[PDB]
Amino acid sequence: YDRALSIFSPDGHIFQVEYALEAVKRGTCAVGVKGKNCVVLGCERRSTLKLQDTRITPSKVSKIDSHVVLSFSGLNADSRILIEKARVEAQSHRLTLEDPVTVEYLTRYVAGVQQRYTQSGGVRPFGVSTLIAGFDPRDDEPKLYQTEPSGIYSSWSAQTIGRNSKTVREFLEKNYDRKEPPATVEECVKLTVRSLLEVVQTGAKNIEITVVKPDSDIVALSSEEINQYVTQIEQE
Amino acid sequence: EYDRGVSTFSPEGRLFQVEYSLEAIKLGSTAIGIATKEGVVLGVEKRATSPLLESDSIEKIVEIDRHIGCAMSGLTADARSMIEHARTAAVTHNLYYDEDINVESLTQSVCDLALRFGEGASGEERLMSRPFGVALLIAGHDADDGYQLFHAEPSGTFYRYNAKAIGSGSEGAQAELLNEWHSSLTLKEAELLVLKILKQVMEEKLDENNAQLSCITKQDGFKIYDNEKTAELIKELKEKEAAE
Amino acid sequence: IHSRKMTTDDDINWQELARSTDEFNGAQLKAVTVEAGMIALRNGQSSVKHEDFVEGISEVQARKSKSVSFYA
Amino acid sequence: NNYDGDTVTFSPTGRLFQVEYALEAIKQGSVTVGLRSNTHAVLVALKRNADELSSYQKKIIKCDEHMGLSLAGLAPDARVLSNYLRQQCNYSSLVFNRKLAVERAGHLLCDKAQKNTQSYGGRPYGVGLLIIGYDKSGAHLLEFQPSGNVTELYGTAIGARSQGAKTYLERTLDTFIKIDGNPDELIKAGVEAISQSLRDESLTVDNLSIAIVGKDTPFTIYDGEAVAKYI
Amino acid sequence: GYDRHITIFSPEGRLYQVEYAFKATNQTNINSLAVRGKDCTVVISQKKVPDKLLDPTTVSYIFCISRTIGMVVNGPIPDARNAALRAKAEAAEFRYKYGYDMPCDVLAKRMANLSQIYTQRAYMRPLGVILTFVSVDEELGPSIYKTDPAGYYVGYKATATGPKQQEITTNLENHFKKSKIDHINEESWEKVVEFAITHMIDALGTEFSKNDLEVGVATKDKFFTLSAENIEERLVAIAEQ
Amino acid sequence: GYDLSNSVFSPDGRNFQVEYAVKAVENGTTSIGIKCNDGVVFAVEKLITSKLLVPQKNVKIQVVDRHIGCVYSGLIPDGRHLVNRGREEAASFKKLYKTPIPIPAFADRLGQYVQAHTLYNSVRPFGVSTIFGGVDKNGAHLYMLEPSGSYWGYKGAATGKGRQSAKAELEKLVDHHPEGLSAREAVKQAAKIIYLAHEDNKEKDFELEISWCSLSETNGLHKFVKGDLLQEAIDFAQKEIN
């Protein structure tokens, strides 16, 4: 078996990459905003249906490392496969190179799973896009990367993927700047909360926020915290 | 038809998917390259898509080794496989011989990877279904023939060039190369030549956060020029357009 | 048999002409004798140059060049 | 398209159509002319560039100091057959202490091409090689079809306009066979053979690449000013 | 809908591919007739000698699997040799690993299982030969089991194969109506050959030569074929009856 | 329908693709094999398509073991690949049983292989007929192997275009000799029916190649008939059709 499930196109394309990006489109929305002393990945959560126990329901942000976080959009089945594989990569940088992973290493690795399925047959690339962010050890520089299901990656200052990413992108043109990112943890967090309240809306019940602070600090902001930012921003 | 098989001959008499590979170079952000005997310069268009983009960490300039530089243009999903392979190959040569690898030999190795379409042709292991979709401008300096520039196709074929431009704007670039290439260029006159041809096929304001220059020099090695130097060179081009 | 009808140069040899055609048939050789006189009128010459017979083979084969080449 | 997308079907006409398509790769490609005498074989290849900014690409690959091949077809298909020929040639020296016989290397090459034409997901390779060498049986000039078939000739050609080259070589057939011991004359006659394979491509000195092999003359490829003496 | 191209079921509950295998055995036109004697099992079969440039002694459809088990094959001769080779291989295997020669009943079943696996692969086409196995075992007496390209076999009092084999079935059936036993009682193996030929002649309405027949006889614990001279003696004896 | 592969099968009990491949053999060169009392004399038409060719240097005759000549028609590479496979098989037999492989035995092994490729869709049917035989301790033998994977013993066989002229005159040859002819005689009779089978190939001109394995001429080894004796046969055959 090696019967192409990825095959070249008459436009000089690959069919499965075009389909993959649309599979990332119809999935959830991720916004990534990086300050000078934090990264923030806030993402859309499907918990619309009632009688769902939101607490034991899978998160949209999964920590891979004690200061490297990963959030996802696209198929929810595929993302969890990557997140098991990344965890192996994380222990392998420690194994042979010591030190926990750099953000940049992990970005090339996710992409390298995608890459594999892109050139070979019997496999197809996952319809998954990620926002990878965090610190490298002994750095207090925020890193914000994006991977896409092609096997391509891009650095960003801000990025958004998912549904109505263009609305959010334009909102951050008028707020966020490459030149001077927010100089505070809370200001960054509130800008990501403000962007999500456009499209995702629907309180702190669908809106999540994860904050990483420099050099081995992962903290999660509970529903209650998220709700307090929501009301203040609404009023303002 | 002839695109459902990754190894079939067509009623023209040569591969159809390979043609599509040549038409995947025309989706790449232009990479331009001028070789002279004073060193070889590679410039690439990064392409800004938003001011949300971080572009001074993105580049299509790549180091294969100390004495060989590369610029890629086309599908860059494909180029990741090929660049990693180029990096191993160079290091293998230096493992085996304690010696610098020729620019021609290094390029030829990467063409061998490029021919790996099929899943049942010959004996050698096929790790793909199709061809790649990316061309290379591997520049370098070896101590045999001096400075060298090669253009490698995803076909598995390579030519030595004195100047080559690949990417979307390749034909409009190549017209300017015919009239503007000569043997009495300098390193710095070559460097301004890159930006001139790049400015026409640029779709934006030519500046230093969407263009990157790099040299390969014998005595400096492979140096990627910082955006300060790029900004300077860009401004002096406009002064030579203030001469016309 | 076409050159019977038309004025031609006498310095042409039908064996030279037979070397430079490879896998041609009579319709194409209609397209070489007539094509000679197109080149002839364009020069401005009464007669049909013996160079014009050679140049009607390449100008009109049945196709304009031998097709794309990009690795052959 | 009925059998033309498949490499495993016949073909009510007793063909495989893939083999004819693999043949058209020679027509679109470069041209090379080979001719031999008893004491020498000669390849004169017409090298080809892409444009003027482009240098010309070697169409002659040295396999050994008594063996060389030339491509007229697609280069990546040539890249498979050339490695295999080089490996089996060093192997012959290694194991049997033997300069690899040109005839026998042709038969190993024939069956190799065949088993990828037999296999589905394979192809017949779209490169024609003219393979020269001087071995224990004298000089040889072989013709490699895409199918695999090897035929031995005193003069042959492949490429576009090859038909006119073979007309030339059938005329001068007994002339060049009876000049022996002078490598200079065989080369000169091969220049005139491939002059009938021009369509105003012109022979210059950086287009022209000649390689010969002799009774006592190693396989050596001339270029530069070493082909300028034969124009 | 490819249910005639690969070996998958149709909505008729039948594999068409498999049915087509039976329609190849009637195209080579070899008829066989096999009866169980009292100490032998006899199988007579057509030999088609079409030209003067075929040597009839090497024209075969009787393959001797084991020492005691002949096999006659009805259908294309490429598939015949592949089947004969396989059958032999497994029988030698059985002697080797279980320490006695393979019975006919079990040999029919072993080839039946591989033929069924060849109708379960979609890249291995079944062999289109109907195989008759004749023997005299000392555990089942004289035996006939006939296997088919589907993977079905059953025991037989007598059997026939070929295009005109329905005609043969009638004659044989009448013969076993009269005796009211499932085998011919006659202690000479030679006269069981003569009876077999009589039933073939009735069915096909053709008289035979020695080189139109090829005869195999399984006696107790040996299988041999008659040579062409010996077959003529049997055909001379048809007239003596 | 019913030719898209060879695991298709028709309600006609035919495989179409395989019948089509026999047409490739019909496009081959003429080749004959005469079964003699004490051997076999093979002969094959080698066309001269140009005076560029080198005569009696392109063999269609490859020996297997030492005593089995194999000569073919149809697709020349496919038959050389068939004979490469069978040379490995010949060696294995010699390994295991320390004797040269018999003619019936060599036939069986080739037949399974050609028979296998008309069942698999992963490997393409053959397009060769090979005529092969020789002398071992069980006599002289002659075998013709179809691309369908069928063979028989033969008193005469042929394949190629010009088998029409060849086959007929072998009916007269058996009728000349219903107890066959000498190995000596068959040199001049193998040559003679290539020259009569040069009337289905009378567009071109040809070179005669002749080889034999017989007990009484070469001692049951396959050797090439060369020199003055090859040329004696060519002079004989040349007179018959004139």
Side-chain angles (χ1 to χ4, degrees):
Chain A
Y1 199 89
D2 79 314
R3 186 268 181 277
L5 304 189
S6 326
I7 201 173
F8 224 64
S9 308
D11 293 281
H13 300 346
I14 296 158
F15 289 110
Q16 282 319 293
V17 166
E18 306 164 58
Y19 303 164
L21 290 162
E22 312 157 78
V24 167
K25 189 46 166 185
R26 300 164 175 243
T28 45
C29 185
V31 194
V33 185
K34 78 183 209 190
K36 314 199 166 168
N37 43 39
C38 66
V39 296
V40 183
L41 301 181
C43 191
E44 173 187 305
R45 211 184 201 180
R46 304 205 192 256
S47 48
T48 303
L49 289 169
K50 304 197 190 81
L51 302 182
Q52 208 175 97
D53 182 350
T54 307
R55 294 212 308 168
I56 68 166
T57 284
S59 298
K60 301 304 199 286
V61 178
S62 307
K63 63 174 273 208
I64 309 305
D65 195 16
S66 274
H67 68 283
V68 183
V69 293
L70 190 139
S71 192
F72 46 90
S73 312
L75 293 69
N76 295 339
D78 302 3
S79 42
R80 313 172 295 103
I81 319 300
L82 290 156
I83 286 161
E84 301 211 283
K85 289 200 194 92
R87 262 323 4 269
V88 179
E89 181 63 297
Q91 299 309 121
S92 300
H93 181 275
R94 288 181 160 116
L95 189 79
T96 52
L97 310 164
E98 286 198 79
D99 323 315
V101 284
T102 67
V103 176
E104 157 173 337
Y105 187 66
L106 206 56
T107 311
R108 287 170 282 103
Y109 182 69
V110 183
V113 164
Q114 299 301 124
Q115 200 287 300
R116 241 325 16 173
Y117 307 164
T118 304
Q119 21 192 156
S120 288
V123 288
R124 50 87 176 156
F126 297 147
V128 181
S129 178
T130 61
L131 296 171
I132 312 191
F135 301 87
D136 303 22
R138 301 177 301 283
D139 303 33
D140 61 332
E141 288 56 287
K143 315 300 195 308
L144 164 65
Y145 281 82
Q146 187 277 333
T147 316
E148 81 187 81
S150 311
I152 303 164
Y153 43 88
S154 282
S155 191
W156 295 93
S157 309
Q159 182 52 10
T160 170
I161 53 176
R163 37 171 53 185
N164 306 341
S165 46
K166 177 46 64 186
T167 298
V168 163
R169 179 176 320 268
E170 282 171 299
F171 183 65
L172 286 152
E173 287 174 62
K174 310 302 183 286
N175 295 10
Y176 186 99
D177 201 345
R178 171 170 181 195
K179 291 182 171 181
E180 303 280 289
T184 302
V185 161
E186 286 301 83
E187 295 293 298
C188 198
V189 158
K190 283 173 170 52
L191 176 50
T192 314
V193 171
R194 205 174 301 116
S195 313
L196 292 168
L197 287 166
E198 304 174 284
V199 166
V200 184
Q201 318 181 97
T202 311
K205 187 262 292 195
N206 286 331
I207 294 172
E208 302 195 62
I209 285 299
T210 302
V211 190
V212 192
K213 308 197 187 197
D215 294 331
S216 330
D217 297 326
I218 288 184
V219 280
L221 310 193
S222 63
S223 311
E224 292 23 290
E225 306 299 270
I226 299 180
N227 171 71
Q228 298 173 97
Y229 313 137
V230 166
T231 40
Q232 295 187 267
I233 291 163
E234 276 177 301
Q235 170 70 87
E236 168 178 72
Chain B
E1 277 195 289
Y2 315 120
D3 67 356
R4 286 274 81 86
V6 283
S7 310
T8 190
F9 271 82
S10 59
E12 185 166 77
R14 52 168 66 222
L15 291 160
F16 276 2
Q17 294 184 11
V18 169
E19 245 170 310
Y20 309 155
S21 313
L22 307 162
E23 277 185 53
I25 317 294
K26 297 206 184 221
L27 307 173
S29 294
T30 4
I32 293 150
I34 311 298
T36 61
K37 311 292 195 303
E38 284 90 61
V40 174
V41 288
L42 301 173
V44 296
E45 183 174 313
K46 293 184 231 174
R47 182 73 43 160
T49 62
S50 296
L52 295 191
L53 199 66
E54 187 62 67
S55 301
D56 306 336
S57 54
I58 299 177
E59 51 193 271
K60 296 206 140 176
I61 293 297
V62 287
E63 191 172 284
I64 301 186
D65 58 54
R66 187 252 169 212
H67 54 276
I68 298 184
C70 185
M72 54 182 135
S73 197
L75 223 346
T76 47
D78 299 326
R80 312 225 177 252
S81 170
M82 298 192 91
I83 187 63
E84 292 226 298
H85 162 65
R87 291 177 158 145
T88 321
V91 161
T92 316
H93 186 281
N94 189 238
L95 175 56
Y96 268 140
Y97 300 118
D98 230 36
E99 186 68 332
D100 303 1
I101 183 165
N102 293 351
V103 191
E104 185 175 60
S105 179
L106 190 261
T107 292
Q108 180 179 244
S109 291
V110 173
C111 287
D112 295 76
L113 197 81
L115 176 110
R116 230 163 293 247
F117 47 96
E119 303 286 35
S122 50
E124 76 182 67
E125 165 69 57
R126 296 316 185 172
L127 303 167
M128 318 165 74
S129 52
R130 56 205 182 59
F132 291 125
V134 70
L136 297 316
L137 300 185
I138 299 165
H141 167 80
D142 69 330
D144 287 338
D145 308 339
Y147 299 95
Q148 298 198 269
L149 174 62
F150 282 94
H151 163 252
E153 298 131 325
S155 317
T157 319
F158 56 108
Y159 291 91
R160 194 184 186 191
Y161 266 93
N162 286 72
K164 182 60 186 225
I166 50 172
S168 305
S170 39
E171 349 186 92
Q174 155 112 347
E176 292 178 91
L177 297 174
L178 289 165
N179 297 85
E180 303 238 32
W181 180 89
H182 56 96
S183 294
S184 298
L185 293 153
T186 59
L187 194 48
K188 301 299 185 287
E189 199 183 288
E191 246 172 282
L192 293 157
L193 188 46
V194 182
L195 301 163
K196 174 70 185 223
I197 296 174
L198 173 63
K199 173 157 185 274
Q200 310 296 327
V201 301
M202 183 74 73
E203 308 305 54
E204 296 190 81
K205 184 248 180 157
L206 174 61
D207 75 345
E208 69 300 318
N209 296 348
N210 71 9
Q212 186 68 277
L213 294 161
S214 178
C215 68
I216 170 62
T217 328
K218 178 214 153 142
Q219 45 232 50
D220 309 334
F222 178 82
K223 300 286 221 354
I224 316 179
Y225 292 128
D226 72 322
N227 314 50
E228 187 61 90
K229 178 76 170 178
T230 303
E232 235 182 83
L233 293 166
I234 282 165
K235 293 298 180 194
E236 279 170 24
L237 170 67
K238 305 205 194 294
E239 296 185 354
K240 292 170 186 55
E241 300 193 271
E244 358 183 5
Chain C
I1 284 294
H2 317 295
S3 298
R4 181 190 64 221
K5 170 185 192 301
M6 54 182 297
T7 199
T8 62
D9 281 36
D10 63 344
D11 303 329
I12 185 64
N13 174 213
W14 318 94
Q15 273 312 317
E16 295 168 18
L17 297 180
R19 303 319 185 204
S20 39
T21 59
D22 301 316
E23 300 175 90
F24 281 52
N25 76 7
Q28 310 175 247
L29 297 169
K30 195 176 148 189
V32 169
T33 52
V34 161
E35 202 47 50
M38 306 316 306
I39 304 169
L41 174 58
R42 285 172 195 149
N43 307 343
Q45 293 185 23
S46 169
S47 307
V48 178
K49 228 328 157 72
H50 70 289
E51 308 182 4
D52 302 356
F53 282 100
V54 167
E55 281 189 327
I57 297 164
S58 43
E59 185 150 307
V60 174
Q61 308 178 230
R63 61 182 172 207
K64 299 307 188 272
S65 76
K66 39 205 194 0
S67 265
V68 178
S69 311
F70 60 87
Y71 62 111
Chain D
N1 168 325
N2 242 64
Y3 306 109
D4 297 349
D6 295 27
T7 74
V8 73
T9 47
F10 286 76
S11 192
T13 54
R15 302 201 175 135
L16 177 63
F17 301 102
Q18 307 300 285
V19 173
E20 286 81 66
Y21 306 140
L23 195 67
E24 291 170 72
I26 318 295
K27 308 172 173 80
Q28 306 189 33
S30 313
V31 60
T32 177
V33 167
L35 67 140
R36 81 180 182 93
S37 55
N38 304 340
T39 49
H40 296 104
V42 174
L43 289 177
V44 185
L46 174 59
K47 298 190 305 294
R48 197 173 55 175
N49 60 2
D51 70 313
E52 289 310 294
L53 299 179
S54 184
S55 67
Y56 299 72
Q57 184 54 30
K58 298 298 299 290
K59 311 293 190 173
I60 310 171
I61 296 163
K62 177 166 181 307
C63 184
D64 210 330
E65 281 157 310
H66 64 7
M67 187 174 252
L69 67 128
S70 59
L71 72 96
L74 307 171
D77 291 273
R79 186 53 200 180
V80 169
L81 306 192
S82 62
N83 293 354
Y84 173 66
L85 269 156
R86 281 187 281 211
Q87 294 168 298
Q88 293 299 299
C89 178
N90 283 358
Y91 190 70
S92 183
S93 286
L94 177 66
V95 175
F96 303 109
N97 187 285
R98 201 170 292 168
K99 40 162 59 80
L100 178 61
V102 195
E103 303 191 75
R104 291 193 306 220
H107 310 297
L108 305 167
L109 196 64
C110 168
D111 295 341
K112 183 257 178 94
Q114 235 314 94
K115 62 179 186 228
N116 322 34
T117 315
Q118 204 155 60
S119 297
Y120 181 50
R123 51 174 188 280
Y125 288 92
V127 64
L129 299 177
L130 303 188
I131 316 177
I132 61 169
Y134 198 99
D135 64 85
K136 346 175 183 90
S137 307
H140 291 22
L141 162 62
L142 297 182
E143 192 201 9
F144 175 86
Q145 297 315 85
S147 299
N149 176 237
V150 286
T151 31
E152 171 59 52
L153 310 89
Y154 300 110
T156 194
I158 44 170
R161 300 169 291 284
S162 50
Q163 277 81 43
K166 293 179 273 166
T167 304
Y168 180 92
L169 294 170
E170 197 169 333
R171 284 193 277 166
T172 56
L173 186 69
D174 297 343
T175 307
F176 54 70
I177 283 169
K178 310 275 189 261
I179 301 315
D180 295 320
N182 306 111
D184 315 341
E185 295 318 294
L186 286 308
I187 299 174
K188 287 166 191 301
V191 164
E192 291 175 334
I194 198 163
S195 293
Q196 308 310 312
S197 291
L198 299 180
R199 202 183 301 266
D200 302 341
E201 304 177 29
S202 317
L203 289 162
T204 329
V205 298
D206 54 1
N207 309 1
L208 185 52
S209 188
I210 306 171
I212 61 161
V213 62
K215 191 188 201 302
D216 291 328
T217 293
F219 180 86
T220 298
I221 312 182
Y222 312 119
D223 254 326
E225 284 285 283
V227 300
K229 324 281 71 191
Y230 301 113
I231 305 171
Chain E
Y2 310 109
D3 355 341
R4 301 166 298 279
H5 299 90
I6 54 177
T7 61
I8 63 169
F9 284 88
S10 68
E12 182 110 331
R14 303 230 187 228
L15 297 126
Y16 303 116
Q17 173 51 244
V18 190
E19 297 177 291
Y20 303 154
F22 298 103
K23 306 190 177 156
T25 76
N26 289 4
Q27 296 300 11
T28 45
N29 306 110
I30 309 310
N31 284 270
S32 62
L33 186 156
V35 290
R36 282 165 60 219
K38 179 55 187 225
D39 67 284
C40 66
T41 295
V42 170
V43 62
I44 62 191
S45 70
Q46 289 187 318
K47 188 168 64 193
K48 298 299 172 190
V49 182
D51 304 306
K52 305 185 300 217
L53 304 176
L54 229 64
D55 185 354
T57 6
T58 317
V59 175
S60 312
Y61 284 99
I62 314 192
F63 303 93
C64 301
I65 299 307
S66 317
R67 294 165 58 194
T68 76
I69 317 196
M71 163 172 97
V72 179
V73 176
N74 299 132
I77 194 74
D79 289 354
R81 286 183 172 103
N82 195 5
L85 187 199
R86 229 7 221 186
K88 281 156 188 174
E90 295 304 292
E93 179 75 319
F94 197 93
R95 168 69 168 137
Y96 172 51
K97 293 237 192 298
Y98 294 102
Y100 74 114
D101 190 29
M102 180 100 150
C104 189
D105 161 23
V106 184
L107 183 58
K109 166 181 190 177
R110 184 65 52 83
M111 291 299 288
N113 295 351
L114 298 158
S115 307
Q116 186 286 324
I117 285 169
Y118 306 157
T119 67
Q120 177 166 22
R121 303 310 177 207
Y123 45 78
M124 188 53 169
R125 180 172 64 126
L127 302 176
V129 281
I130 300 181
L131 311 156
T132 312
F133 298 95
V134 292
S135 63
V136 181
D137 303 341
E138 310 304 307
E139 303 168 318
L140 297 167
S143 304
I144 304 164
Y145 297 91
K146 186 173 58 54
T147 297
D148 70 3
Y152 187 84
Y153 85 102
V154 65
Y156 287 91
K157 314 178 171 63
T159 193
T161 22
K164 300 196 35 192
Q165 54 84 26
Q166 193 54 75
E167 307 324 347
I168 294 168
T169 310
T170 326
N171 310 110
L172 295 171
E173 173 59 324
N174 306 173
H175 196 177
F176 291 135
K177 237 193 272 297
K178 304 150 123 292
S179 57
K180 302 179 184 54
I181 190 163
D182 60 84
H183 65 14
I184 300 178
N185 301 331
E186 168 55 78
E187 293 109 44
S188 297
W189 61 261
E190 292 188 24
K191 297 202 143 307
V192 180
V193 183
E194 292 163 34
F195 304 154
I197 290 174
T198 305
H199 300 127
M200 202 181 231
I201 285 181
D202 299 345
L204 298 196
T206 312
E207 28 190 321
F208 294 113
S209 319
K210 49 187 174 303
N211 295 58
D212 285 70
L213 287 173
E214 191 180 21
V215 176
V217 185
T219 50
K220 280 185 195 310
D221 291 7
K222 72 190 175 282
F223 183 72
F224 58 93
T225 58
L226 296 190
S227 66
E229 285 83 0
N230 298 350
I231 294 161
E232 190 64 302
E233 291 175 292
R234 306 285 67 67
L235 283 161
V236 159
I238 295 303
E240 309 250 304
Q241 299 179 159
Chain F
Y2 304 133
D3 45 17
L4 294 181
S5 71
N6 57 62
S7 298
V8 309
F9 203 36
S10 52
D12 297 339
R14 293 185 301 158
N15 196 8
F16 277 21
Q17 184 154 96
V18 187
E19 267 178 49
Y20 298 157
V22 185
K23 307 189 162 86
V25 194
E26 197 53 74
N27 306 48
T29 41
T30 309
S31 185
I32 63 136
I34 311 175
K35 186 212 169 189
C36 312
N37 298 318
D38 299 337
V40 272
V41 179
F42 311 99
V44 67
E45 184 179 358
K46 160 175 173 176
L47 292 172
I48 292 171
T49 326
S50 51
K51 313 107 236 143
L52 306 167
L53 288 152
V54 177
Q56 302 189 102
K57 212 66 190 292
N58 297 127
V59 296
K60 300 167 177 76
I61 304 137
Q62 307 188 336
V63 73
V64 186
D65 199 323
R66 290 191 89 55
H67 72 276
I68 310 191
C70 307
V71 63
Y72 41 81
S73 297
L75 297 162
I76 294 296
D78 201 12
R80 188 177 284 104
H81 182 73
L82 181 61
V83 166
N84 183 25
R85 185 67 169 81
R87 284 169 356 192
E88 293 158 327
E89 288 174 312
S92 307
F93 208 94
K94 226 185 281 182
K95 195 198 175 282
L96 189 57
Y97 296 117
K98 294 294 256 307
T99 182
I101 184 161
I103 318 304
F106 177 73
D108 184 305
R109 291 199 181 200
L110 292 180
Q112 298 302 283
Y113 186 49
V114 169
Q115 200 279 339
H117 283 44
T118 67
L119 301 170
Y120 275 88
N121 297 344
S122 291
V123 289
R124 171 177 58 92
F126 286 85
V128 297
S129 188
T130 308
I131 311 227
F132 66 95
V135 183
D136 65 317
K137 50 190 54 66
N138 298 343
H141 288 96
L142 181 59
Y143 286 100
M144 191 171 40
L145 181 57
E146 297 298 298
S148 173
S150 312
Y151 64 87
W152 292 130
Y154 290 98
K155 298 180 195 193
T159 189
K161 296 183 176 278
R163 78 188 80 176
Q164 291 173 87
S165 323
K167 285 295 210 68
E169 211 290 297
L170 292 166
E171 303 181 278
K172 300 197 276 300
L173 192 63
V174 165
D175 188 39
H176 295 330
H177 308 278
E179 43 65 58
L181 78 174
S182 195
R184 205 32 170 207
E185 186 43 59
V187 190
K188 308 315 172 307
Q189 291 311 108
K192 172 181 189 297
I193 49 166
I194 300 285
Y195 260 92
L196 297 206
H198 181 52
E199 302 287 283
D200 292 333
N201 274 302
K202 44 171 171 61
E203 297 81 65
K204 311 186 171 68
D205 64 349
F206 86 109
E207 162 76 34
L208 194 65
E209 289 186 272
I210 298 193
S211 62
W212 49 1
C213 190
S214 64
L215 182 45
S216 72
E217 304 287 327
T218 38
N219 306 333
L221 291 162
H222 181 274
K223 298 194 199 187
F224 197 69
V225 184
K226 82 294 185 164
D228 283 359
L229 195 44
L230 150 152
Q231 196 164 300
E232 273 170 20
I234 282 156
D235 282 349
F236 179 108
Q238 167 167 40
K239 282 157 176 79
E240 310 295 300
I241 186 61
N242 294 106

